[PDB]
Amino acid sequence: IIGGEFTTIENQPWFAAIYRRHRGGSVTYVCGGSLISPCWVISATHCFIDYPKKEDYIVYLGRSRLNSNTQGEMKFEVENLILHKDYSADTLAHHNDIALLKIRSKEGRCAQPSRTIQTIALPSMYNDPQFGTSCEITGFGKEQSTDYLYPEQLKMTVVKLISHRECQQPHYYGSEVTTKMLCAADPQWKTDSCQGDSGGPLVCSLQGRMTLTGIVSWGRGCALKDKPGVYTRVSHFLPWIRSHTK
Ligand SMILES: N=C(N)c1ccc2cccc(N)c2c1
Ligand code: NA
């Protein structure tokens, strides 16, 4: 997250921290995710497509820092790694950038909701917020594009939704951004999601209820003029989520 502010997991209790164990035992942060039900974390396929071994991953819930065991946190293994069959990546655009992680503790249990571990509601069909709506993003992603390390403390920011017509403008992304994708950015281009924030939530308050409107997918650089963050439009994939979580 470029700009924004430092936060803690109590303010984003659906946020999942996904790590990968490497050969030799080193563990590195991969992507963010969202708890949509006690057994299921939703993220982006591009986070896992090159290493699609469910055994390689570690999932934390209720974790506020990259290298601290936050009080009340829960650690999980991935029981099932479901990647969207029609995923593909162009130079910029990521297609069907959605994944499901069925989580299981070493005892074989799913998440136990607490004050710091909660689910995020899914959106309803054909009911996304209008352009200009302020939405929040959360992640352990880069604070600056030139950084090579990720911030130790969880960050959050607020961005505004951009219409598909505006995002398809030539100086924006042209025909590369599709109707299955949602753009969001800062009108002043100072705050944004960045590398490392992928898979993380774009949460919008709609009709008084907070919902998982988007999943951090792609963008040209970070917080660059006319280059919004691009998110998987979760409302399009509701038949796919429902069928793959049964
Ligand atoms: N500009 C963005 N919001 C954005 C979002 C996700 C990204 C993922 C990998 C690399 C980037 N530069 C990204 C930028
Ligand atoms: Na690390």
PDB file of C-alpha atoms and ligand atoms in Angstrom:
ATOM      1  CA  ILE A   1       0.000   0.000   0.000  1.00  0.00           C
ATOM      2  CA  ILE A   2       1.406   3.395  -1.157  1.00  0.00           C
ATOM      3  CA  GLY A   3       0.379   6.098   1.327  1.00  0.00           C
ATOM      4  CA  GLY A   4      -2.645   5.411   3.512  1.00  0.00           C
ATOM      5  CA  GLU A   5      -1.997   4.472   7.142  1.00  0.00           C
ATOM      6  CA  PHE A   6      -0.700   1.683   9.358  1.00  0.00           C
ATOM      7  CA  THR A   7      -3.476  -0.453  10.859  1.00  0.00           C
ATOM      8  CA  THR A   8      -4.033  -3.650  12.868  1.00  0.00           C
ATOM      9  CA  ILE A   9      -6.018  -6.835  12.125  1.00  0.00           C
ATOM     10  CA  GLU A  10      -8.912  -5.812  14.467  1.00  0.00           C
ATOM     11  CA  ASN A  11      -9.886  -3.201  11.805  1.00  0.00           C
ATOM     12  CA  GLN A  12      -9.668  -5.777   8.926  1.00  0.00           C
ATOM     13  CA  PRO A  13     -10.571  -9.161  10.607  1.00  0.00           C
ATOM     14  CA  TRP A  14     -11.322 -10.905   7.241  1.00  0.00           C
ATOM     15  CA  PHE A  15      -7.743 -10.249   6.038  1.00  0.00           C
ATOM     16  CA  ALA A  16      -5.696 -13.391   5.354  1.00  0.00           C
ATOM     17  CA  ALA A  17      -1.886 -13.325   5.195  1.00  0.00           C
ATOM     18  CA  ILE A  18      -0.625 -15.955   2.739  1.00  0.00           C
ATOM     19  CA  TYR A  19       2.978 -17.233   2.878  1.00  0.00           C
ATOM     20  CA  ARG A  20       4.938 -19.894   0.987  1.00  0.00           C
ATOM     21  CA  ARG A  21       7.424 -22.367   2.495  1.00  0.00           C
ATOM     22  CA  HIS A  22      10.443 -22.806   0.244  1.00  0.00           C
ATOM     23  CA  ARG A  23      12.733 -25.844  -0.138  1.00  0.00           C
ATOM     24  CA  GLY A  24      15.213 -25.447   2.722  1.00  0.00           C
ATOM     25  CA  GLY A  25      12.603 -24.082   5.141  1.00  0.00           C
ATOM     26  CA  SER A  26      12.536 -20.312   4.431  1.00  0.00           C
ATOM     27  CA  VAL A  27       9.056 -18.749   4.491  1.00  0.00           C
ATOM     28  CA  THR A  28       8.226 -15.659   2.389  1.00  0.00           C
ATOM     29  CA  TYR A  29       5.069 -13.553   2.124  1.00  0.00           C
ATOM     30  CA  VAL A  30       3.108 -14.178  -1.096  1.00  0.00           C
ATOM     31  CA  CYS A  31      -0.245 -12.356  -1.192  1.00  0.00           C
ATOM     32  CA  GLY A  32      -3.252 -11.236   0.797  1.00  0.00           C
ATOM     33  CA  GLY A  33      -6.648 -12.897   0.945  1.00  0.00           C
ATOM     34  CA  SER A  34     -10.147 -12.621   2.429  1.00  0.00           C
ATOM     35  CA  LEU A  35     -12.057 -15.020   4.650  1.00  0.00           C
ATOM     36  CA  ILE A  36     -15.483 -15.499   2.961  1.00  0.00           C
ATOM     37  CA  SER A  37     -16.551 -18.444   5.229  1.00  0.00           C
ATOM     38  CA  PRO A  38     -14.674 -20.255   8.101  1.00  0.00           C
ATOM     39  CA  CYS A  39     -13.175 -22.860   5.674  1.00  0.00           C
ATOM     40  CA  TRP A  40     -12.584 -20.549   2.704  1.00  0.00           C
ATOM     41  CA  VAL A  41     -10.106 -17.809   1.793  1.00  0.00           C
ATOM     42  CA  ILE A  42     -10.545 -15.970  -1.516  1.00  0.00           C
ATOM     43  CA  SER A  43      -7.468 -14.538  -3.288  1.00  0.00           C
ATOM     44  CA  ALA A  44      -6.025 -14.149  -6.846  1.00  0.00           C
ATOM     45  CA  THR A  45      -4.838 -17.042  -9.078  1.00  0.00           C
ATOM     46  CA  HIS A  46      -1.678 -15.092 -10.236  1.00  0.00           C
ATOM     47  CA  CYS A  47      -0.339 -15.444  -6.626  1.00  0.00           C
ATOM     48  CA  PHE A  48      -0.213 -19.264  -6.987  1.00  0.00           C
ATOM     49  CA  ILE A  49      -0.209 -20.152 -10.753  1.00  0.00           C
ATOM     50  CA  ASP A  50       3.668 -20.625 -10.852  1.00  0.00           C
ATOM     51  CA  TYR A  51       3.748 -22.709  -7.620  1.00  0.00           C
ATOM     52  CA  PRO A  52       0.330 -24.514  -7.668  1.00  0.00           C
ATOM     53  CA  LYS A  53       1.233 -26.956  -4.810  1.00  0.00           C
ATOM     54  CA  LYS A  54      -1.302 -26.397  -2.003  1.00  0.00           C
ATOM     55  CA  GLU A  55       1.306 -27.972   0.427  1.00  0.00           C
ATOM     56  CA  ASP A  56       3.686 -24.998  -0.078  1.00  0.00           C
ATOM     57  CA  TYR A  57       1.340 -22.432   1.542  1.00  0.00           C
ATOM     58  CA  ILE A  58       0.743 -21.063   5.039  1.00  0.00           C
ATOM     59  CA  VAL A  59      -2.373 -18.997   5.790  1.00  0.00           C
ATOM     60  CA  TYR A  60      -2.751 -16.737   8.816  1.00  0.00           C
ATOM     61  CA  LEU A  61      -5.904 -15.133  10.172  1.00  0.00           C
ATOM     62  CA  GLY A  62      -5.839 -12.446  12.902  1.00  0.00           C
ATOM     63  CA  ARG A  63      -2.222 -11.503  12.029  1.00  0.00           C
ATOM     64  CA  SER A  64      -1.282  -7.757  12.102  1.00  0.00           C
ATOM     65  CA  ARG A  65       2.472  -7.918  11.385  1.00  0.00           C
ATOM     66  CA  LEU A  66       4.602  -9.685   8.729  1.00  0.00           C
ATOM     67  CA  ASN A  67       6.980 -11.246  11.312  1.00  0.00           C
ATOM     68  CA  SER A  68       5.095 -11.220  14.646  1.00  0.00           C
ATOM     69  CA  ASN A  69       2.773 -13.821  16.110  1.00  0.00           C
ATOM     70  CA  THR A  70      -0.170 -11.475  16.788  1.00  0.00           C
ATOM     71  CA  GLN A  71      -2.124 -12.438  19.945  1.00  0.00           C
ATOM     72  CA  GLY A  72      -5.218 -14.406  18.910  1.00  0.00           C
ATOM     73  CA  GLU A  73      -3.836 -15.275  15.434  1.00  0.00           C
ATOM     74  CA  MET A  74      -4.620 -18.701  13.852  1.00  0.00           C
ATOM     75  CA  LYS A  75      -2.316 -20.612  11.422  1.00  0.00           C
ATOM     76  CA  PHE A  76      -3.586 -22.903   8.628  1.00  0.00           C
ATOM     77  CA  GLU A  77      -2.568 -25.225   5.832  1.00  0.00           C
ATOM     78  CA  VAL A  78      -4.347 -25.296   2.474  1.00  0.00           C
ATOM     79  CA  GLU A  79      -6.625 -28.361   2.128  1.00  0.00           C
ATOM     80  CA  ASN A  80      -7.604 -27.384  -1.433  1.00  0.00           C
ATOM     81  CA  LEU A  81      -6.153 -24.782  -3.800  1.00  0.00           C
ATOM     82  CA  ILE A  82      -8.750 -23.931  -6.452  1.00  0.00           C
ATOM     83  CA  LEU A  83      -7.506 -21.862  -9.386  1.00  0.00           C
ATOM     84  CA  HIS A  84      -9.818 -20.439 -12.071  1.00  0.00           C
ATOM     85  CA  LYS A  85      -9.506 -22.735 -15.183  1.00  0.00           C
ATOM     86  CA  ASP A  86      -9.483 -19.799 -17.618  1.00  0.00           C
ATOM     87  CA  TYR A  87      -6.809 -17.688 -15.849  1.00  0.00           C
ATOM     88  CA  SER A  88      -4.316 -15.893 -18.145  1.00  0.00           C
ATOM     89  CA  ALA A  89      -1.919 -12.950 -17.935  1.00  0.00           C
ATOM     90  CA  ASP A  90      -1.268 -10.423 -20.711  1.00  0.00           C
ATOM     91  CA  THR A  91       1.493  -7.729 -20.429  1.00  0.00           C
ATOM     92  CA  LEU A  92      -0.732  -5.864 -17.923  1.00  0.00           C
ATOM     93  CA  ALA A  93      -4.217  -7.435 -17.665  1.00  0.00           C
ATOM     94  CA  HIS A  94      -4.791 -10.560 -15.590  1.00  0.00           C
ATOM     95  CA  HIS A  95      -7.846 -12.577 -16.612  1.00  0.00           C
ATOM     96  CA  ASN A  96     -10.071 -14.559 -14.219  1.00  0.00           C
ATOM     97  CA  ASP A  97      -7.663 -13.537 -11.420  1.00  0.00           C
ATOM     98  CA  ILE A  98      -9.512 -15.388  -8.649  1.00  0.00           C
ATOM     99  CA  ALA A  99      -8.586 -18.341  -6.412  1.00  0.00           C
ATOM    100  CA  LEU A 100     -10.059 -20.237  -3.483  1.00  0.00           C
ATOM    101  CA  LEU A 101      -8.092 -21.670  -0.611  1.00  0.00           C
ATOM    102  CA  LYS A 102      -9.794 -24.247   1.589  1.00  0.00           C
ATOM    103  CA  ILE A 103      -8.043 -23.798   4.963  1.00  0.00           C
ATOM    104  CA  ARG A 104      -7.473 -26.410   7.665  1.00  0.00           C
ATOM    105  CA  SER A 105      -5.621 -26.288  10.997  1.00  0.00           C
ATOM    106  CA  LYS A 106      -3.219 -29.131  11.926  1.00  0.00           C
ATOM    107  CA  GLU A 107      -6.194 -30.483  14.007  1.00  0.00           C
ATOM    108  CA  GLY A 108      -8.323 -30.474  10.844  1.00  0.00           C
ATOM    109  CA  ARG A 109     -10.552 -27.519  11.694  1.00  0.00           C
ATOM    110  CA  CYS A 110     -11.609 -24.387   9.866  1.00  0.00           C
ATOM    111  CA  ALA A 111     -11.368 -20.793  11.226  1.00  0.00           C
ATOM    112  CA  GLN A 112     -12.918 -19.996  14.604  1.00  0.00           C
ATOM    113  CA  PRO A 113     -14.519 -16.494  14.409  1.00  0.00           C
ATOM    114  CA  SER A 114     -13.254 -14.079  17.095  1.00  0.00           C
ATOM    115  CA  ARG A 115     -12.870 -10.300  17.613  1.00  0.00           C
ATOM    116  CA  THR A 116      -9.825 -10.397  15.215  1.00  0.00           C
ATOM    117  CA  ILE A 117     -11.061 -13.220  12.879  1.00  0.00           C
ATOM    118  CA  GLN A 118     -14.312 -12.555  10.982  1.00  0.00           C
ATOM    119  CA  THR A 119     -15.756 -13.238   7.524  1.00  0.00           C
ATOM    120  CA  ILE A 120     -16.461 -10.562   4.863  1.00  0.00           C
ATOM    121  CA  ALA A 121     -19.847 -10.711   3.090  1.00  0.00           C
ATOM    122  CA  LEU A 122     -19.903 -11.441  -0.648  1.00  0.00           C
ATOM    123  CA  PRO A 123     -21.661  -8.905  -2.945  1.00  0.00           C
ATOM    124  CA  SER A 124     -25.066  -9.554  -4.532  1.00  0.00           C
ATOM    125  CA  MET A 125     -25.452 -10.117  -8.338  1.00  0.00           C
ATOM    126  CA  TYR A 126     -25.692  -7.000 -10.650  1.00  0.00           C
ATOM    127  CA  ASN A 127     -25.394  -4.699  -7.598  1.00  0.00           C
ATOM    128  CA  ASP A 128     -21.917  -3.074  -7.492  1.00  0.00           C
ATOM    129  CA  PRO A 129     -21.416   0.453  -5.998  1.00  0.00           C
ATOM    130  CA  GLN A 130     -21.521   3.378  -8.461  1.00  0.00           C
ATOM    131  CA  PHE A 131     -18.317   5.099  -9.675  1.00  0.00           C
ATOM    132  CA  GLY A 132     -16.995   7.636  -7.129  1.00  0.00           C
ATOM    133  CA  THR A 133     -17.791   5.374  -4.115  1.00  0.00           C
ATOM    134  CA  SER A 134     -14.939   5.323  -1.572  1.00  0.00           C
ATOM    135  CA  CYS A 135     -13.651   1.823  -0.850  1.00  0.00           C
ATOM    136  CA  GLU A 136     -10.904   0.452   1.367  1.00  0.00           C
ATOM    137  CA  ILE A 137      -7.917  -1.778   0.479  1.00  0.00           C
ATOM    138  CA  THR A 138      -5.664  -3.676   2.901  1.00  0.00           C
ATOM    139  CA  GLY A 139      -2.280  -5.309   2.507  1.00  0.00           C
ATOM    140  CA  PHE A 140       1.370  -5.939   3.359  1.00  0.00           C
ATOM    141  CA  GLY A 141       2.365  -4.748  -0.168  1.00  0.00           C
ATOM    142  CA  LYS A 142       5.108  -2.231  -1.093  1.00  0.00           C
ATOM    143  CA  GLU A 143       4.963   1.280   0.405  1.00  0.00           C
ATOM    144  CA  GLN A 144       6.883   2.600  -2.688  1.00  0.00           C
ATOM    145  CA  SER A 145       7.482   0.960  -6.120  1.00  0.00           C
ATOM    146  CA  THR A 146      11.282   1.275  -5.537  1.00  0.00           C
ATOM    147  CA  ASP A 147      11.059  -0.729  -2.253  1.00  0.00           C
ATOM    148  CA  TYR A 148      12.131  -4.384  -2.387  1.00  0.00           C
ATOM    149  CA  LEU A 149      10.987  -5.182   1.216  1.00  0.00           C
ATOM    150  CA  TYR A 150       7.371  -5.200   2.450  1.00  0.00           C
ATOM    151  CA  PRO A 151       6.206  -3.102   5.486  1.00  0.00           C
ATOM    152  CA  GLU A 152       6.312  -5.001   8.811  1.00  0.00           C
ATOM    153  CA  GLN A 153       2.981  -3.518   9.874  1.00  0.00           C
ATOM    154  CA  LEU A 154      -0.308  -4.048   7.982  1.00  0.00           C
ATOM    155  CA  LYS A 155      -1.508  -1.037   5.981  1.00  0.00           C
ATOM    156  CA  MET A 156      -4.838   0.242   4.674  1.00  0.00           C
ATOM    157  CA  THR A 157      -5.949   3.041   2.357  1.00  0.00           C
ATOM    158  CA  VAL A 158      -9.123   4.415   0.769  1.00  0.00           C
ATOM    159  CA  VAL A 159      -9.555   4.755  -3.038  1.00  0.00           C
ATOM    160  CA  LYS A 160     -12.524   5.712  -5.292  1.00  0.00           C
ATOM    161  CA  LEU A 161     -14.204   3.442  -7.864  1.00  0.00           C
ATOM    162  CA  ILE A 162     -13.701   4.425 -11.519  1.00  0.00           C
ATOM    163  CA  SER A 163     -16.314   3.610 -14.209  1.00  0.00           C
ATOM    164  CA  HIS A 164     -15.450   1.089 -16.964  1.00  0.00           C
ATOM    165  CA  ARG A 165     -15.934   3.838 -19.634  1.00  0.00           C
ATOM    166  CA  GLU A 166     -13.315   6.070 -17.894  1.00  0.00           C
ATOM    167  CA  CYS A 167     -10.940   3.188 -17.246  1.00  0.00           C
ATOM    168  CA  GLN A 168     -11.115   2.193 -20.973  1.00  0.00           C
ATOM    169  CA  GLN A 169      -9.894   5.672 -22.012  1.00  0.00           C
ATOM    170  CA  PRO A 170      -6.627   5.615 -24.101  1.00  0.00           C
ATOM    171  CA  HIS A 171      -4.412   7.269 -21.378  1.00  0.00           C
ATOM    172  CA  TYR A 172      -5.939   4.861 -18.816  1.00  0.00           C
ATOM    173  CA  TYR A 173      -5.965   1.175 -19.937  1.00  0.00           C
ATOM    174  CA  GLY A 174      -7.947   1.256 -23.219  1.00  0.00           C
ATOM    175  CA  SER A 175      -9.645  -2.027 -24.213  1.00  0.00           C
ATOM    176  CA  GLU A 176      -7.145  -3.969 -21.954  1.00  0.00           C
ATOM    177  CA  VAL A 177      -9.464  -3.508 -18.926  1.00  0.00           C
ATOM    178  CA  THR A 178     -12.704  -5.566 -19.314  1.00  0.00           C
ATOM    179  CA  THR A 179     -16.249  -5.519 -17.790  1.00  0.00           C
ATOM    180  CA  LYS A 180     -15.115  -8.426 -15.502  1.00  0.00           C
ATOM    181  CA  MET A 181     -12.622  -5.939 -13.911  1.00  0.00           C
ATOM    182  CA  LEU A 182     -13.109  -2.949 -11.640  1.00  0.00           C
ATOM    183  CA  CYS A 183     -10.863   0.137 -11.492  1.00  0.00           C
ATOM    184  CA  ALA A 184     -10.217   2.121  -8.342  1.00  0.00           C
ATOM    185  CA  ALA A 185      -7.732   4.901  -7.538  1.00  0.00           C
ATOM    186  CA  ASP A 186      -6.926   8.129  -5.717  1.00  0.00           C
ATOM    187  CA  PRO A 187      -8.076  11.200  -7.784  1.00  0.00           C
ATOM    188  CA  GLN A 188      -4.708  12.802  -6.687  1.00  0.00           C
ATOM    189  CA  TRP A 189      -2.638   9.611  -7.537  1.00  0.00           C
ATOM    190  CA  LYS A 190      -0.854   9.639  -4.118  1.00  0.00           C
ATOM    191  CA  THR A 191      -2.307   6.456  -2.582  1.00  0.00           C
ATOM    192  CA  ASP A 192      -2.806   2.965  -4.138  1.00  0.00           C
ATOM    193  CA  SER A 193      -2.344  -0.799  -3.819  1.00  0.00           C
ATOM    194  CA  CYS A 194       1.003  -2.117  -5.106  1.00  0.00           C
ATOM    195  CA  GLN A 195       3.012  -5.320  -5.594  1.00  0.00           C
ATOM    196  CA  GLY A 196       2.443  -7.573  -2.559  1.00  0.00           C
ATOM    197  CA  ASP A 197      -1.151  -6.356  -2.063  1.00  0.00           C
ATOM    198  CA  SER A 198      -2.395  -8.811  -4.773  1.00  0.00           C
ATOM    199  CA  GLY A 199      -5.160 -11.173  -3.656  1.00  0.00           C
ATOM    200  CA  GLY A 200      -6.171  -8.723  -0.905  1.00  0.00           C
ATOM    201  CA  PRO A 201      -9.626  -7.198  -0.374  1.00  0.00           C
ATOM    202  CA  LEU A 202     -11.306  -4.158  -1.904  1.00  0.00           C
ATOM    203  CA  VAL A 203     -14.130  -3.614   0.571  1.00  0.00           C
ATOM    204  CA  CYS A 204     -17.021  -1.238  -0.204  1.00  0.00           C
ATOM    205  CA  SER A 205     -19.852  -0.186   2.043  1.00  0.00           C
ATOM    206  CA  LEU A 206     -23.055  -0.539   0.016  1.00  0.00           C
ATOM    207  CA  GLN A 207     -26.600   0.005   1.348  1.00  0.00           C
ATOM    208  CA  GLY A 208     -25.010   0.162   4.830  1.00  0.00           C
ATOM    209  CA  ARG A 209     -23.327  -3.284   4.500  1.00  0.00           C
ATOM    210  CA  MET A 210     -19.609  -3.919   3.934  1.00  0.00           C
ATOM    211  CA  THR A 211     -18.856  -6.333   1.070  1.00  0.00           C
ATOM    212  CA  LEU A 212     -15.919  -7.868  -0.782  1.00  0.00           C
ATOM    213  CA  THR A 213     -16.371  -5.841  -3.996  1.00  0.00           C
ATOM    214  CA  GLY A 214     -12.930  -6.560  -5.430  1.00  0.00           C
ATOM    215  CA  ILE A 215      -9.702  -8.589  -5.239  1.00  0.00           C
ATOM    216  CA  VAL A 216      -6.361  -6.776  -5.869  1.00  0.00           C
ATOM    217  CA  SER A 217      -5.272  -7.985  -9.292  1.00  0.00           C
ATOM    218  CA  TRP A 218      -3.067  -5.657 -11.420  1.00  0.00           C
ATOM    219  CA  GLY A 219      -1.974  -2.116 -12.320  1.00  0.00           C
ATOM    220  CA  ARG A 220       0.623  -0.206 -14.354  1.00  0.00           C
ATOM    221  CA  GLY A 221       3.222   0.729 -11.726  1.00  0.00           C
ATOM    222  CA  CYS A 222       1.852   1.993  -8.388  1.00  0.00           C
ATOM    223  CA  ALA A 223      -0.003   5.296  -7.704  1.00  0.00           C
ATOM    224  CA  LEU A 224       0.868   6.435 -11.265  1.00  0.00           C
ATOM    225  CA  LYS A 225      -1.185   9.157 -13.025  1.00  0.00           C
ATOM    226  CA  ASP A 226      -4.081   7.686 -15.127  1.00  0.00           C
ATOM    227  CA  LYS A 227      -3.082   4.166 -14.024  1.00  0.00           C
ATOM    228  CA  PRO A 228      -5.689   2.889 -11.520  1.00  0.00           C
ATOM    229  CA  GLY A 229      -5.492  -0.294  -9.504  1.00  0.00           C
ATOM    230  CA  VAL A 230      -7.444  -3.054 -11.285  1.00  0.00           C
ATOM    231  CA  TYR A 231      -9.531  -5.493  -9.272  1.00  0.00           C
ATOM    232  CA  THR A 232     -11.362  -8.741  -9.988  1.00  0.00           C
ATOM    233  CA  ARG A 233     -15.071  -7.804  -9.953  1.00  0.00           C
ATOM    234  CA  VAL A 234     -16.243 -10.355  -7.353  1.00  0.00           C
ATOM    235  CA  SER A 235     -20.017  -9.942  -8.287  1.00  0.00           C
ATOM    236  CA  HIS A 236     -19.300 -11.470 -11.763  1.00  0.00           C
ATOM    237  CA  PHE A 237     -17.802 -14.628 -10.189  1.00  0.00           C
ATOM    238  CA  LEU A 238     -20.636 -15.388  -7.659  1.00  0.00           C
ATOM    239  CA  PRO A 239     -21.794 -18.547  -9.664  1.00  0.00           C
ATOM    240  CA  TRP A 240     -18.097 -19.741  -9.771  1.00  0.00           C
ATOM    241  CA  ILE A 241     -17.526 -19.063  -5.993  1.00  0.00           C
ATOM    242  CA  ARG A 242     -20.792 -20.812  -4.967  1.00  0.00           C
ATOM    243  CA  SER A 243     -20.087 -23.868  -7.216  1.00  0.00           C
ATOM    244  CA  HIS A 244     -16.420 -24.187  -6.093  1.00  0.00           C
ATOM    245  CA  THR A 245     -17.177 -23.808  -2.300  1.00  0.00           C
ATOM    246  CA  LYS A 246     -19.707 -26.728  -2.356  1.00  0.00           C
TER     247      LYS A 246
HETATM  248  N1  LIG B   1      -1.268  -0.059  -9.232  1.00  0.00           N
HETATM  249  C1  LIG B   1      -1.862  -1.055  -8.562  1.00  0.00           C
HETATM  250  N2  LIG B   1      -2.855  -0.822  -7.708  1.00  0.00           N
HETATM  251  C2  LIG B   1      -1.312  -2.349  -8.615  1.00  0.00           C
HETATM  252  C3  LIG B   1      -2.042  -3.470  -8.175  1.00  0.00           C
HETATM  253  C4  LIG B   1      -1.457  -4.743  -8.162  1.00  0.00           C
HETATM  254  C5  LIG B   1      -0.134  -4.898  -8.595  1.00  0.00           C
HETATM  255  C6  LIG B   1       0.448  -6.170  -8.602  1.00  0.00           C
HETATM  256  C7  LIG B   1       1.775  -6.335  -9.007  1.00  0.00           C
HETATM  257  C8  LIG B   1       2.535  -5.244  -9.443  1.00  0.00           C
HETATM  258  C9  LIG B   1       1.956  -3.971  -9.443  1.00  0.00           C
HETATM  259  N3  LIG B   1       2.648  -2.911  -9.873  1.00  0.00           N
HETATM  260  C10 LIG B   1       0.623  -3.782  -9.018  1.00  0.00           C
HETATM  261  C11 LIG B   1       0.014  -2.518  -9.024  1.00  0.00           C
HETATM  262 NA    NA B   2       9.059 -11.914   5.232  1.00  0.00          NA
END
